[PDB]
Amino acid sequence: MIAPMEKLVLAGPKGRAKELLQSLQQAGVVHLETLRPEALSAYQLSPEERA
């Protein structure tokens, strides 16, 4: 039996975004999604984080 595979939506601030993505990536049991077209930007990340 294939698992029912629920959806997980999160939000918040961006220093907390990097920190919660760290804490979500340490317990790595989640798949990702683009979530572009509605009401938000494509998130060009940062220049210093790109370096």
Place this chain on the structure above:
Amino acid sequence: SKLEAILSQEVEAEIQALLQEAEAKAEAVKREAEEKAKALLQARERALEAQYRAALRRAESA
């Protein structure tokens, strides 16, 4: 909501610290201008007092 309160409170306090920085900058602009104004007034008063002393010496010579 709760996350609205978090985001608004935190980065609005950041904006408030930015406004405090701007007001400190404006105060540092005004301070040196007041210093130059009072120094100009004192130099003008000194030149006037030297002028009046020279006028008194001229009156004494006459």
